[PDB]
Enzyme design. Structure first.
Site, short mmCIF file in Angstrom:
data_model
loop_
_atom_site.label_atom_id
_atom_site.label_comp_id
_atom_site.label_asym_id
_atom_site.label_seq_id
_atom_site.Cartn_x
_atom_site.Cartn_y
_atom_site.Cartn_z
N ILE A 72 -8.07 3.18 -17.61
CA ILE A 72 -8.92 2.87 -16.45
C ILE A 72 -9.38 4.19 -15.79
CG2 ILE A 72 -9.07 1.76 -14.14
CD1 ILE A 72 -7.15 -0.53 -15.27
N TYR A 119 0.70 12.68 -8.85
CA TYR A 119 -0.46 12.34 -9.67
C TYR A 119 -0.05 11.41 -10.84
N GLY A 120 -1.04 10.96 -11.63
CA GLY A 120 -0.82 10.10 -12.78
C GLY A 120 -2.02 9.31 -13.28
N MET A 121 -1.77 8.44 -14.29
CA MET A 121 -2.75 7.60 -15.00
C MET A 121 -2.60 6.10 -14.63
SD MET A 121 -3.32 7.21 -19.15
CE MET A 121 -3.81 8.88 -19.59
N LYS A 151 0.04 1.66 -12.92
CA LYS A 151 -0.17 3.03 -12.50
C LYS A 151 1.08 3.86 -12.80
CE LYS A 151 -0.10 3.94 -7.95
NZ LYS A 151 -0.54 4.27 -6.57
N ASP A 203 -6.99 6.24 4.89
CA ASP A 203 -7.87 6.74 3.83
C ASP A 203 -8.77 5.61 3.33
OD1 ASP A 203 -7.50 8.53 0.64
OD2 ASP A 203 -8.91 8.89 2.29
N1 LIG Z 1 -11.31 4.13 -11.88
C1 LIG Z 1 -10.81 4.09 -10.49
C2 LIG Z 1 -9.85 2.98 -10.44
C3 LIG Z 1 -10.44 1.72 -10.32
C4 LIG Z 1 -9.68 0.57 -10.29
C5 LIG Z 1 -8.30 0.64 -10.40
C6 LIG Z 1 -7.48 -0.60 -10.38
C7 LIG Z 1 -7.83 -1.81 -11.01
N2 LIG Z 1 -6.95 -2.77 -10.77
N3 LIG Z 1 -5.99 -2.21 -9.97
C8 LIG Z 1 -6.26 -0.90 -9.73
C9 LIG Z 1 -5.34 -0.13 -8.99
C10 LIG Z 1 -3.98 -0.36 -8.93
N4 LIG Z 1 -3.41 0.60 -8.16
C11 LIG Z 1 -4.39 1.47 -7.74
C12 LIG Z 1 -4.01 2.69 -6.99
O1 LIG Z 1 -2.86 2.83 -6.56
N5 LIG Z 1 -4.97 3.59 -6.78
C13 LIG Z 1 -4.79 4.73 -5.90
C14 LIG Z 1 -4.05 5.88 -6.54
C15 LIG Z 1 -3.20 6.69 -5.78
C16 LIG Z 1 -2.50 7.74 -6.35
C17 LIG Z 1 -2.63 7.96 -7.71
C18 LIG Z 1 -3.45 7.16 -8.50
C19 LIG Z 1 -4.17 6.14 -7.90
C20 LIG Z 1 -3.36 7.55 -9.95
C21 LIG Z 1 -2.46 8.78 -9.86
O2 LIG Z 1 -2.05 8.94 -8.47
C22 LIG Z 1 -5.61 1.04 -8.21
C23 LIG Z 1 -7.70 1.89 -10.53
C24 LIG Z 1 -8.45 3.06 -10.53
C25 LIG Z 1 -7.68 4.36 -10.63
F1 LIG Z 1 -7.64 4.84 -11.86
F2 LIG Z 1 -8.17 5.32 -9.86
F3 LIG Z 1 -6.41 4.24 -10.22
#
Ligand SMILES: NCc1ccc(-c2cn[nH]c2-c2c[nH]c(C(=O)NCc3ccc4c(c3)CCO4)c2)cc1C(F)(F)F
Length: 341
Positions: free
Chosen positions: A21, A24-26, A42, A137
């Site tokens: 998707i 820090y992290g993926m 995550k 934020d």
């Molecule tokens: N491409 C941007 C994006 C879009 C949608 C989503 C998504 C879809 N379904 N659920 C999610 C989601 C679940 N948890 C979060 C989430 O926690 N996003 C915020 C975040 C905070 C810290 C951090 C990261 C992210 C990655 C490494 O460190 C988003 C996640 C992301 C992503 F990758 F940023 F987390």
């Protein structure tokens, strides 16, 4: 040990068929074999830097205590069975098809969508603020949406317990939250320890939903204040009198007079009720800025307003001076309830 885009992503037997998707992290999407629904996972690796630990912990603590339709949950937390083997933490959350940042880049939002999105943001925010928590934020990328436009607030990494008695600071005090959604008082005399800081960000989100462009796209710290003043106009005498800090007040006094840009000139197609609520959220003085419950009661949201169906937290909710080692243990202990043991 499943691999995704040249990185370890071992979520165990429960979660399978992974798809990348973002970062820090993926973050990946995956199939949950227990609930049989696709979920979002995550992976975070924060144990090197104590700030990453502090953000991981406060978010875990807040999201495990929170339970609301318009707030992202934590369904499961996957990690190693021992502190020693724990290199990564996998947070399992709601899978959502898009986010408001993605939508706003290519989609014209109808007034009905804008109205509904704003209602859900504020409904989620009412719950957050009732818990004495500030998100700090709020921005379109932190607002997840599914295929039916259900909205969920995510990322509580910068969230804090409201602390209005310790909100004052000097002029040009450094701040972490996303620049474009920063309230004017952040640059002047505020630490962002009051509820009024989130309302400002929601005001920015609303203006962005109306034109598909951030209303105050500051390019640097003080440029952010200049963008805000370029539209709101010069603060009144009353609003300047509330800023006791001499450096902040004199900076504002040094600026040439600027007239307010009328909202209906900036937003000629917007609903008049939406612009009236926009005005109340994007109020220069944080004390006069509308509160989340007043915002929910505004005529613009009349089709949705139902305070009996706008739940509040059952109870209100130090990590500043704490090392990454102690925080690792706290992350280990807070995630204990999800282990198969
Ligand atoms: N491409 C941007 C994006 C879009 C949608 C989503 C998504 C879809 N379904 N659920 C999610 C989601 C679940 N948890 C979060 C989430 O926690 N996003 C915020 C975040 C905070 C810290 C951090 C990261 C992210 C990655 C490494 O460190 C988003 C996640 C992301 C992503 F990758 F940023 F987390």
């Amino acid at each position: 040990p499943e691999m995704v885009r040249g990185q370890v992503f071992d979520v165990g037997p429960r979660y399978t068929n992974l798809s990348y998707i973002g970062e820090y992290g993926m973050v990946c999407s995956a199939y949950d074999n227990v609930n049989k629904v696709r979920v979002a996972i995550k992976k975070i690796s924060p144990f090197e830097h104590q700030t990453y630990c502090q953000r991981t912990l406060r978010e875990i603590k807040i999201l495990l205590r929170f339970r609301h339709e318009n707030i992202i949950g934590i369904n499961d937390i996957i990690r190693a069975p021992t502190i020693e083997q724990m290199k990564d933490v996998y947070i399992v959350q709601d899978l959502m098809e898009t986010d408001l940042y993605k939508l706003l880049k290519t989609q014209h939002l109808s007034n009905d969508h804008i109205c509904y999105f704003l209602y859900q943001i504020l409904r989620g925010l009412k719950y957050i603020h009732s818990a004495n928590v500030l998100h700090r934020d709020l921005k379109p990328s932190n607002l997840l949406l599914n295929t039916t436009c259900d909205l969920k607030i995510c990322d509580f990494g910068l969230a804090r317990v409201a602390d209005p008695d310790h909100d004052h600071t000097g002029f040009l005090t450094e701040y972490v939250a996303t620049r474009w959604y920063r309230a004017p008082e952040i640059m002047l005399n505020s630490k962002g320890y009051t509820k009024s800081i989130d309302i400002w960000s929601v005001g920015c989100i609303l203006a962005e939903m109306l034109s598909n462009r951030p209303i105050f796209p500051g390019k640097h710290y003080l440029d952010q204040l200049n963008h805000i003043l370029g539209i709101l106009g010069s603060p009144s005498q009353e609003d300047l009198n509330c800023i006791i800090n001499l450096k902040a007040r004199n900076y504002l006094l040094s600026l040439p007079h600027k007239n307010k840009v009328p909202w209906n000139r900036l937003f000629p197609n917007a609903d008049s009720k939406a612009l009236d609520l926009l005005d109340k959220m994007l109020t220069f003085n944080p004390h006069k800025r509308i509160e989340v419950e007043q915002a929910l009661a505004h005529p613009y949201l009349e089709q949705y307003y139902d305070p009996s169906d706008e739940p509040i937290a059952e109870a209100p909710f130090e990590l500043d001076d704490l090392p990454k080692e102690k925080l690792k243990e706290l992350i280990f202990e807070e995630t204990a309830r999800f282990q198969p043991g």
